[PDB]
Amino acid sequence: TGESYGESVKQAVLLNVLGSGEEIPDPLSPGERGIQAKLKELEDEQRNELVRLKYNDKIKEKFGKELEEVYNFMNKQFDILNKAVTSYNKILTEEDLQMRRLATALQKEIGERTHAETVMVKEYRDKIDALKNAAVATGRAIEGAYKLKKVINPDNALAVSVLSKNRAIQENHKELMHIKNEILPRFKKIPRAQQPQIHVYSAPWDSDDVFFFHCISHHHANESFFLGFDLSIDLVHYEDLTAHWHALGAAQTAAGRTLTEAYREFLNLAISNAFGTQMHTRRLVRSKTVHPIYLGSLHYDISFSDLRGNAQRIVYDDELQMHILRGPIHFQRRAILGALKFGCKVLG
Amino acid sequence: TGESYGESVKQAVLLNVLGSGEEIPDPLSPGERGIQAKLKELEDEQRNELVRLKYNDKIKEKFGKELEEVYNFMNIKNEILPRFKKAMDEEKEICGIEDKVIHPKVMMKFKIPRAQQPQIHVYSAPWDSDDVFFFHCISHHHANESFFLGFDLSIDLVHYEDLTAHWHALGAAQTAAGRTLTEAYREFLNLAISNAFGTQMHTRRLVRSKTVHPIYLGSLHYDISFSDLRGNAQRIVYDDELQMHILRGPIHFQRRAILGALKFGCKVLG
Amino acid sequence: TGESYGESVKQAVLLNVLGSGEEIPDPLSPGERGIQAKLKELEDEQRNELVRLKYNDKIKEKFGKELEEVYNFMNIKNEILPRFKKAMDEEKEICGIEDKVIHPKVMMKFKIPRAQQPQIHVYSAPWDSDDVFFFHCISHHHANESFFLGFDLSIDLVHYEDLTAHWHALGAAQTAAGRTLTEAYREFLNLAISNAFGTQMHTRRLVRSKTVHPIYLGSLHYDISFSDLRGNAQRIVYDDELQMHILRGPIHFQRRAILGALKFGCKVLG
């Protein structure tokens, strides 16, 4: 085969992407999503327990009573909140300092840094090489371990990546410290609720093949889109649906493509195709006059414009549909959801 | 998709009942059952290990505090007595670490213990197995009451039959008369053929499966009184608002919804 | 309840083999393989941590007992001797936190090391993928042996074909004569197309599948002798009741049974 090398690399990357246990849940299976979530939760709690019980001595000598006593007691209010806020702020500052030192050593012309920085850089390079072939606590382990958050609620390329990560961590830490300082005055007196919403619907009588996603943005409240898939016929249908201000006669309304007529037009388009089994058309006709089944909602952390771009890229890209739209139907749905969520990055 | 309140809230509650990975496995697929059983086992044993870990840690901390007081005052009686009280309390708390908790386990066995729990057998036709299957439900502590519930999901076909046998007099002899599994299955297939919404290839597999005994795929025992199971079988074969949710959707969802409805009657929605 | 008790015992043995959720993943869906591997890893980690908890709690119990005895005596060295022995044992056992010996090499593989094991690639046709699919099993430490095993579970056909390349002389020149995997695939598809049990729309998909390379769904490897794989493939092909038990049922369970029979030949069936 003289056309199966770059596609082979892309396919291998796709298979690695789809191999994770708790990533890319099956859109048309609530049980699979529940299984993935429960498995992730179990491993998360087990890892926190292991890292809590692991040291318990150097942690005790560094910041022992401050976090352990509060966690054991909470497992009055103003004092506990102040102590927890101070401990969280000092943890974030310490992480900032150590990653900043690592970054400054990374852009320190490593053939010139001192012995300790050379040792640390070599250790991180060994970590990267081990991960490439395949007592660790990045900083989130402590915060998720002692239930702090729960009760509060060329080598220069890797150098640049680590610098960007350190800058992001510093910004998050500064925001958290400002929030805790504000919370202290209240007692003395991660995005949420703005993420895009994806609802997964499926036509009743042949939902294994035909389904669609309805996506509604937030903090705009007038932009949405419809993305419909039929896998027996290999048909993908996109349309943006919004709401403008339209005056009919002497009255105002929001003249935009309604979801209902969107779904009806998609069904009509899927009916007129020669590859129908002379009964698939019958199923689509029967399902044309009934409300589609709601099959749950998925939420993530990505801008709505990014989702629009990803959907439009899926629609008019040939090799992307050569990759994600060939295979078993379960793999089909998983690859479609992954491509929608991550875009073209799913292949390399 | 214009439906104000009703269908929306029923489908929401149904998804929330089916949104958990611990309960209601797909009966047709023993792999999902194994995954769910292992997941249950890991949750329970890790909660046991967590409570034992916490109680041993707290008793060790109490002992170390007593030791440190002894060390720092050697060169605490009111503390020693409170320490002994705490140690006795912690030993009592940590005694049930060997998983000897049967009261919570038997709390659901108020009237239905083991060897009295009703059995459910899952059967499937040999060829279009993913779409057609049925349950043979047998009761214990009676050995005389049983029923048949058959679903052909592609065509939207549901059949219920009552296989209860009873004493009968035949001349100068006696017998146990009543419907039996073989003729129930054969009549169900016979009724499935004459439906108008066949596929002229689905019918071929059905008629070929009419001459072969069904395939046994396991048994399930759930904490539902067999009288209640019969009641749910009556509701599922009679009512239509319940069916309009349970019998519409992807096949894996449809089968899980059917198992859930058989388990909880009409409690999955509302 | 059906026809025979030998068939039911064989089926029960097969269902118990497939009952576990940590073994015999679905060969076509890599998500299932990932889930099963992660569950197995979590289970082994929990096993090791339970062992470590037992170790640490017994060490702490001995240390606390020695400390309490010393504290009671303090309120010569003869009494402190057991405490010193406990301290020595605790230090020795704490410094022995290693489970990394080469016994784990036979504790997990027990048959063959790395780079001396066959690998099974899995492909499926692009369009009707969930039914037609094949395994390309290529071995190691024989630079010329491999084989092909293809399945079409819609019309229930199994095909096997060796792809071994023997040295051959043609004219006054030499070649490594075997079968091309592409030629094997096209002959398998041609066999599937000309089957009388055609849907007349399934054939237009096999025919479309002929002129495009198949999709690579992944590669896996199990520690079994390659000759055993050859024997198991001809066992799958040339047995009647093995086909009747493994190649009948739900598609998911069918594929799991196929992988299981590749794993164990007929010992899985009993």
Side-chain angles (χ1 to χ4, degrees), chain A residues 291-311:
Chain A
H291 325 99
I293 313 166
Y294 179 70
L295 273 183
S297 65
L298 323 174
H299 57 271
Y300 291 106
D301 62 357
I302 176 168
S303 183
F304 187 78
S305 163
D306 291 331
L307 280 193
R308 186 198 306 285
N310 295 335

PDB file of all heavy atoms in Angstrom, chain A residues 291-311:
ATOM      1  N   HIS A 291     -41.315  13.628  18.396  1.00  0.00           N
ATOM      2  CA  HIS A 291     -40.253  14.358  19.077  1.00  0.00           C
ATOM      3  C   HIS A 291     -39.030  13.466  19.251  1.00  0.00           C
ATOM      4  O   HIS A 291     -39.163  12.325  19.707  1.00  0.00           O
ATOM      5  CB  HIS A 291     -40.734  14.858  20.436  1.00  0.00           C
ATOM      6  CG  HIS A 291     -42.174  15.266  20.454  1.00  0.00           C
ATOM      7  ND1 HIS A 291     -43.174  14.441  20.922  1.00  0.00           N
ATOM      8  CD2 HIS A 291     -42.782  16.409  20.060  1.00  0.00           C
ATOM      9  CE1 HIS A 291     -44.336  15.060  20.817  1.00  0.00           C
ATOM     10  NE2 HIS A 291     -44.127  16.255  20.297  1.00  0.00           N
ATOM     11  N   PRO A 292     -37.835  13.937  18.900  1.00  0.00           N
ATOM     12  CA  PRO A 292     -36.637  13.113  19.080  1.00  0.00           C
ATOM     13  C   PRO A 292     -36.329  12.887  20.550  1.00  0.00           C
ATOM     14  O   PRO A 292     -36.620  13.722  21.409  1.00  0.00           O
ATOM     15  CB  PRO A 292     -35.539  13.938  18.403  1.00  0.00           C
ATOM     16  CG  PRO A 292     -36.016  15.337  18.520  1.00  0.00           C
ATOM     17  CD  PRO A 292     -37.511  15.275  18.382  1.00  0.00           C
ATOM     18  N   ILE A 293     -35.723  11.735  20.832  1.00  0.00           N
ATOM     19  CA  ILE A 293     -35.444  11.349  22.207  1.00  0.00           C
ATOM     20  C   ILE A 293     -34.251  12.130  22.736  1.00  0.00           C
ATOM     21  O   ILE A 293     -33.200  12.208  22.088  1.00  0.00           O
ATOM     22  CB  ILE A 293     -35.193   9.841  22.301  1.00  0.00           C
ATOM     23  CG1 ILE A 293     -36.266   9.081  21.530  1.00  0.00           C
ATOM     24  CG2 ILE A 293     -35.162   9.397  23.745  1.00  0.00           C
ATOM     25  CD1 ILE A 293     -35.918   7.648  21.296  1.00  0.00           C
ATOM     26  N   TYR A 294     -34.409  12.710  23.920  1.00  0.00           N
ATOM     27  CA  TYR A 294     -33.293  13.316  24.626  1.00  0.00           C
ATOM     28  C   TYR A 294     -32.456  12.219  25.269  1.00  0.00           C
ATOM     29  O   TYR A 294     -32.994  11.331  25.937  1.00  0.00           O
ATOM     30  CB  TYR A 294     -33.807  14.294  25.682  1.00  0.00           C
ATOM     31  CG  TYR A 294     -32.726  14.965  26.489  1.00  0.00           C
ATOM     32  CD1 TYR A 294     -31.894  15.913  25.919  1.00  0.00           C
ATOM     33  CD2 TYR A 294     -32.543  14.653  27.826  1.00  0.00           C
ATOM     34  CE1 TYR A 294     -30.905  16.528  26.657  1.00  0.00           C
ATOM     35  CE2 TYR A 294     -31.557  15.262  28.571  1.00  0.00           C
ATOM     36  CZ  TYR A 294     -30.743  16.198  27.983  1.00  0.00           C
ATOM     37  OH  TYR A 294     -29.759  16.808  28.723  1.00  0.00           O
ATOM     38  N   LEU A 295     -31.141  12.270  25.061  1.00  0.00           N
ATOM     39  CA  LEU A 295     -30.244  11.233  25.558  1.00  0.00           C
ATOM     40  C   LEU A 295     -29.131  11.809  26.427  1.00  0.00           C
ATOM     41  O   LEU A 295     -28.051  11.225  26.529  1.00  0.00           O
ATOM     42  CB  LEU A 295     -29.657  10.427  24.402  1.00  0.00           C
ATOM     43  CG  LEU A 295     -30.510   9.245  23.944  1.00  0.00           C
ATOM     44  CD1 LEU A 295     -29.805   8.465  22.852  1.00  0.00           C
ATOM     45  CD2 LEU A 295     -30.837   8.344  25.120  1.00  0.00           C
ATOM     46  N   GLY A 296     -29.378  12.946  27.058  1.00  0.00           N
ATOM     47  CA  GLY A 296     -28.456  13.509  28.025  1.00  0.00           C
ATOM     48  C   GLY A 296     -27.710  14.715  27.479  1.00  0.00           C
ATOM     49  O   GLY A 296     -27.885  15.143  26.335  1.00  0.00           O
ATOM     50  N   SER A 297     -26.860  15.258  28.348  1.00  0.00           N
ATOM     51  CA  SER A 297     -26.079  16.447  28.051  1.00  0.00           C
ATOM     52  C   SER A 297     -24.626  16.224  28.442  1.00  0.00           C
ATOM     53  O   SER A 297     -24.326  15.523  29.410  1.00  0.00           O
ATOM     54  CB  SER A 297     -26.627  17.675  28.784  1.00  0.00           C
ATOM     55  OG  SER A 297     -26.484  17.533  30.186  1.00  0.00           O
ATOM     56  N   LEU A 298     -23.725  16.832  27.675  1.00  0.00           N
ATOM     57  CA  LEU A 298     -22.296  16.795  27.944  1.00  0.00           C
ATOM     58  C   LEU A 298     -21.771  18.217  28.062  1.00  0.00           C
ATOM     59  O   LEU A 298     -22.142  19.092  27.274  1.00  0.00           O
ATOM     60  CB  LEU A 298     -21.539  16.053  26.841  1.00  0.00           C
ATOM     61  CG  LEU A 298     -22.210  14.832  26.215  1.00  0.00           C
ATOM     62  CD1 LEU A 298     -21.389  14.316  25.045  1.00  0.00           C
ATOM     63  CD2 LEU A 298     -22.406  13.743  27.254  1.00  0.00           C
ATOM     64  N   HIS A 299     -20.905  18.444  29.048  1.00  0.00           N
ATOM     65  CA  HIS A 299     -20.320  19.755  29.284  1.00  0.00           C
ATOM     66  C   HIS A 299     -18.811  19.621  29.420  1.00  0.00           C
ATOM     67  O   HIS A 299     -18.305  18.624  29.940  1.00  0.00           O
ATOM     68  CB  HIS A 299     -20.899  20.409  30.540  1.00  0.00           C
ATOM     69  CG  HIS A 299     -20.735  19.585  31.776  1.00  0.00           C
ATOM     70  ND1 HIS A 299     -21.661  18.644  32.172  1.00  0.00           N
ATOM     71  CD2 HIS A 299     -19.748  19.554  32.701  1.00  0.00           C
ATOM     72  CE1 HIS A 299     -21.253  18.071  33.291  1.00  0.00           C
ATOM     73  NE2 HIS A 299     -20.095  18.606  33.634  1.00  0.00           N
ATOM     74  N   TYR A 300     -18.099  20.639  28.953  1.00  0.00           N
ATOM     75  CA  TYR A 300     -16.643  20.621  28.942  1.00  0.00           C
ATOM     76  C   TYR A 300     -16.150  22.052  29.133  1.00  0.00           C
ATOM     77  O   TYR A 300     -16.911  22.932  29.544  1.00  0.00           O
ATOM     78  CB  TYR A 300     -16.124  19.974  27.647  1.00  0.00           C
ATOM     79  CG  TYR A 300     -16.395  18.491  27.555  1.00  0.00           C
ATOM     80  CD1 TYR A 300     -17.372  17.996  26.705  1.00  0.00           C
ATOM     81  CD2 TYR A 300     -15.681  17.585  28.326  1.00  0.00           C
ATOM     82  CE1 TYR A 300     -17.626  16.642  26.618  1.00  0.00           C
ATOM     83  CE2 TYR A 300     -15.927  16.228  28.246  1.00  0.00           C
ATOM     84  CZ  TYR A 300     -16.901  15.763  27.390  1.00  0.00           C
ATOM     85  OH  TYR A 300     -17.151  14.413  27.307  1.00  0.00           O
ATOM     86  N   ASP A 301     -14.872  22.286  28.839  1.00  0.00           N
ATOM     87  CA  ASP A 301     -14.232  23.588  29.035  1.00  0.00           C
ATOM     88  C   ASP A 301     -13.578  24.081  27.741  1.00  0.00           C
ATOM     89  O   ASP A 301     -12.367  23.971  27.536  1.00  0.00           O
ATOM     90  CB  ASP A 301     -13.253  23.509  30.224  1.00  0.00           C
ATOM     91  CG  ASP A 301     -12.115  22.507  30.011  1.00  0.00           C
ATOM     92  OD1 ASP A 301     -12.074  21.818  28.972  1.00  0.00           O
ATOM     93  OD2 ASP A 301     -11.243  22.419  30.901  1.00  0.00           O
ATOM     94  N   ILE A 302     -14.383  24.691  26.876  1.00  0.00           N
ATOM     95  CA  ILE A 302     -13.909  25.119  25.565  1.00  0.00           C
ATOM     96  C   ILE A 302     -14.826  26.227  25.062  1.00  0.00           C
ATOM     97  O   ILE A 302     -16.040  26.189  25.275  1.00  0.00           O
ATOM     98  CB  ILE A 302     -13.844  23.922  24.584  1.00  0.00           C
ATOM     99  CG1 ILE A 302     -13.451  24.380  23.180  1.00  0.00           C
ATOM    100  CG2 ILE A 302     -15.162  23.165  24.568  1.00  0.00           C
ATOM    101  CD1 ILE A 302     -13.089  23.244  22.254  1.00  0.00           C
ATOM    102  N   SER A 303     -14.232  27.220  24.405  1.00  0.00           N
ATOM    103  CA  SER A 303     -14.998  28.334  23.863  1.00  0.00           C
ATOM    104  C   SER A 303     -15.938  27.860  22.758  1.00  0.00           C
ATOM    105  O   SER A 303     -15.645  26.911  22.027  1.00  0.00           O
ATOM    106  CB  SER A 303     -14.059  29.414  23.327  1.00  0.00           C
ATOM    107  OG  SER A 303     -14.784  30.539  22.862  1.00  0.00           O
ATOM    108  N   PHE A 304     -17.084  28.536  22.647  1.00  0.00           N
ATOM    109  CA  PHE A 304     -18.095  28.129  21.676  1.00  0.00           C
ATOM    110  C   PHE A 304     -17.601  28.298  20.245  1.00  0.00           C
ATOM    111  O   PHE A 304     -17.916  27.481  19.371  1.00  0.00           O
ATOM    112  CB  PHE A 304     -19.382  28.921  21.891  1.00  0.00           C
ATOM    113  CG  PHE A 304     -20.526  28.449  21.048  1.00  0.00           C
ATOM    114  CD1 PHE A 304     -21.229  27.307  21.391  1.00  0.00           C
ATOM    115  CD2 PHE A 304     -20.899  29.143  19.913  1.00  0.00           C
ATOM    116  CE1 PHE A 304     -22.282  26.869  20.618  1.00  0.00           C
ATOM    117  CE2 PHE A 304     -21.951  28.707  19.137  1.00  0.00           C
ATOM    118  CZ  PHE A 304     -22.643  27.570  19.490  1.00  0.00           C
ATOM    119  N   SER A 305     -16.843  29.367  19.980  1.00  0.00           N
ATOM    120  CA  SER A 305     -16.297  29.570  18.641  1.00  0.00           C
ATOM    121  C   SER A 305     -15.382  28.419  18.244  1.00  0.00           C
ATOM    122  O   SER A 305     -15.341  28.020  17.073  1.00  0.00           O
ATOM    123  CB  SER A 305     -15.548  30.899  18.575  1.00  0.00           C
ATOM    124  OG  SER A 305     -14.696  30.947  17.445  1.00  0.00           O
ATOM    125  N   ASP A 306     -14.646  27.868  19.210  1.00  0.00           N
ATOM    126  CA  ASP A 306     -13.810  26.705  18.934  1.00  0.00           C
ATOM    127  C   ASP A 306     -14.654  25.507  18.522  1.00  0.00           C
ATOM    128  O   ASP A 306     -14.293  24.778  17.591  1.00  0.00           O
ATOM    129  CB  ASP A 306     -12.962  26.375  20.159  1.00  0.00           C
ATOM    130  CG  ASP A 306     -11.905  27.423  20.431  1.00  0.00           C
ATOM    131  OD1 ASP A 306     -11.444  28.065  19.466  1.00  0.00           O
ATOM    132  OD2 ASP A 306     -11.539  27.612  21.611  1.00  0.00           O
ATOM    133  N   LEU A 307     -15.782  25.285  19.202  1.00  0.00           N
ATOM    134  CA  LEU A 307     -16.666  24.185  18.826  1.00  0.00           C
ATOM    135  C   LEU A 307     -17.252  24.397  17.436  1.00  0.00           C
ATOM    136  O   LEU A 307     -17.372  23.445  16.654  1.00  0.00           O
ATOM    137  CB  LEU A 307     -17.783  24.026  19.857  1.00  0.00           C
ATOM    138  CG  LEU A 307     -17.422  23.283  21.142  1.00  0.00           C
ATOM    139  CD1 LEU A 307     -18.675  22.923  21.922  1.00  0.00           C
ATOM    140  CD2 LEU A 307     -16.611  22.040  20.830  1.00  0.00           C
ATOM    141  N   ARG A 308     -17.633  25.635  17.117  1.00  0.00           N
ATOM    142  CA  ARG A 308     -18.142  25.932  15.781  1.00  0.00           C
ATOM    143  C   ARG A 308     -17.090  25.636  14.719  1.00  0.00           C
ATOM    144  O   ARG A 308     -17.381  25.010  13.691  1.00  0.00           O
ATOM    145  CB  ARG A 308     -18.583  27.394  15.708  1.00  0.00           C
ATOM    146  CG  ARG A 308     -19.267  27.767  14.411  1.00  0.00           C
ATOM    147  CD  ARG A 308     -19.291  29.272  14.210  1.00  0.00           C
ATOM    148  NE  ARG A 308     -19.872  29.981  15.344  1.00  0.00           N
ATOM    149  CZ  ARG A 308     -21.168  30.032  15.617  1.00  0.00           C
ATOM    150  NH1 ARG A 308     -22.057  29.395  14.876  1.00  0.00           N
ATOM    151  NH2 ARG A 308     -21.583  30.740  16.664  1.00  0.00           N
ATOM    152  N   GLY A 309     -15.853  26.075  14.963  1.00  0.00           N
ATOM    153  CA  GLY A 309     -14.780  25.793  14.026  1.00  0.00           C
ATOM    154  C   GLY A 309     -14.514  24.309  13.873  1.00  0.00           C
ATOM    155  O   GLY A 309     -14.277  23.825  12.766  1.00  0.00           O
ATOM    156  N   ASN A 310     -14.556  23.566  14.982  1.00  0.00           N
ATOM    157  CA  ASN A 310     -14.331  22.126  14.917  1.00  0.00           C
ATOM    158  C   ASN A 310     -15.422  21.429  14.116  1.00  0.00           C
ATOM    159  O   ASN A 310     -15.132  20.546  13.300  1.00  0.00           O
ATOM    160  CB  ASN A 310     -14.246  21.544  16.326  1.00  0.00           C
ATOM    161  CG  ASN A 310     -13.052  22.062  17.095  1.00  0.00           C
ATOM    162  OD1 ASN A 310     -12.054  22.478  16.508  1.00  0.00           O
ATOM    163  ND2 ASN A 310     -13.148  22.042  18.419  1.00  0.00           N
ATOM    164  N   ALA A 311     -16.684  21.810  14.330  1.00  0.00           N
ATOM    165  CA  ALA A 311     -17.776  21.200  13.576  1.00  0.00           C
ATOM    166  C   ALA A 311     -17.652  21.508  12.087  1.00  0.00           C
ATOM    167  O   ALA A 311     -17.793  20.615  11.238  1.00  0.00           O
ATOM    168  CB  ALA A 311     -19.120  21.680  14.118  1.00  0.00           C
TER     169      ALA A 311
END
